[PDB]
Design a protein around this nucleic acid. Sequence first.
RNA 1: AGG
Length: 553
Amino acid sequence: SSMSYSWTGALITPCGPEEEKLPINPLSNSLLRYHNKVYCTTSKSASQRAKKVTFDRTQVLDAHYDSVLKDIKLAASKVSARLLTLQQACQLTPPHSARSKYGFGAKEVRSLSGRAVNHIKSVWKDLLEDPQTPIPTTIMAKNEVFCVDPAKGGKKPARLIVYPDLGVRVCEKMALYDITQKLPQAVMGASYGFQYSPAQRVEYLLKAWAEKKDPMGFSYDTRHFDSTVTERDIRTEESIYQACSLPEEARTAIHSLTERLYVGGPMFNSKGQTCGYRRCRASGVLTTSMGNTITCYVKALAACKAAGIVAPTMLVCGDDLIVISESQGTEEDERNLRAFTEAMTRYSAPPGDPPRPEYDLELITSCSSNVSVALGPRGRRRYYLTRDPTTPLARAAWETVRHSPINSWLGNIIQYAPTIWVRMVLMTHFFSILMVQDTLDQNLNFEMYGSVYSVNPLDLPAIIERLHGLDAFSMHTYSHHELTRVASALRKLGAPPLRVWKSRARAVRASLISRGGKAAVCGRYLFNWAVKTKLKLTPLPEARLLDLSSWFT
RNA sequence: AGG
Ligand SMILES: O=c1ccn([C@@H]2O[C@H](COP(=O)(O)OP(=O)(O)O)[C@@H](O)[C@H]2O)c(=O)[nH]1
Ligand SMILES: [Cl-]
Ligand SMILES: [Mn+2]
Ligand SMILES: [Mn+2]
Ligand SMILES: [Mn+2]
């Protein structure tokens, strides 16, 4: 039926200059040695990505699909959502959001300058009046950092980001922001993945596992999800949005956004040239996450019914899903999974890697992470979320004129505080660097799910107890998989091995302790693993006084 | 670029 994209031959050009690595990396050259392996995806590579994501979709739905979709609309009809005022929408614009072509930027939008507010008024009037003329978009490469992988063909090409003008982005929020905050949870309940912290994700997966008499689990992820989303999927997304209780003016803007923007349109490069035409998800529109997650969930639940998955418990985040179900024996399990994949494939959600049944929770990877297990202070099993540290280590070494890696270190330390790789490697390095800089008590930004949080390094013990529990400071006897994977990632990036990190950690610990105050608490709590004569760690008062519920919702 |  439809091609995901068509191209004119015009290049996908960069915005600014693409920052160069330097001959010395003063903050990370004591973390690892193989700086040659750390690269950032470039705009040049964007044309290789374009080739990989351009293909003809044919989609074939069926009664399982139709029935799931009906149930979802019903669930959506229990939501009432409102328009945001123009002003509220303006003030949700992030501070460095790309500026408008019409001579204003995010600062103006957030301050509600008159020229900006006035332009946005007309953009919106035009949405209400013209339900048809396609809205132009800019296409850009995403620049992100990875470690080279010779197995997977050296360097990944940059993903494609497609977005409309700042004025339109503000209007999308007026129309849809309140739905983004309510609909997913309304139609998916506990299956909606972005509502859980790492420990809560873990707790949910364990409950689900223990509920089954004989559990089986698998993960799924779609190859190039955005390019696989069809015109019809997007219109079906609208009908899910329209099932909510909305004021008429929202309805009208939603429909017009759908027809003029979401279902497709022309793409221009940064130099202003026509680049191509799109007939799939623009990753960059406000509905990217909600849309991906709801469309993934519809296809996936229908595919579970098509395949005969029994008592499925799902967890979905964008195109990433886990299903924990009742095993029907391994022969049937395997065939049910092939049936799952075939249905998803008819639904236009083909797999990156064919999924596979598993019967041990450690072997299931979704959203680049997996549950693992270690022993606590009293010898009890303690489960936690971990991941391959390769990419976090590479990002820990991205250091240029424009970019400091310290914030990346902090983000990982917080999300993955119970992991052996955070505790032994990233914590040791982070604290050593900040001590020597004498910047321990300076606040840092921490990025997650598009939001920034300011954190003081000296509050890490409290934050960690709160997010992960006091046992995050006392885990030992990590698993074979985790020990093997961490040792291997360290060798691969030319980092010191764990025993070296241990002797560094002793020195970092002693030095923090000798400063007293909050620093010494960091020393005692964060590095208790580093000394033979363990200390008794008690709950921290400062931790009871904390609420972190917005960080992971 | 969005969440
Ligand atoms: O920086 C990102 C990463 C992902 N996505 C969205 O989430 C989807 C799933 O991404 P995944 O990481 O599974 O890779 P893909 O499936 O795109 O190859 C993408 O297609 C995008 O629509 C996005 O909008 N921006
Ligand atoms: Cl314990
Ligand atoms: Mn994918
Ligand atoms: Mn409509
Ligand atoms: Mn994915």
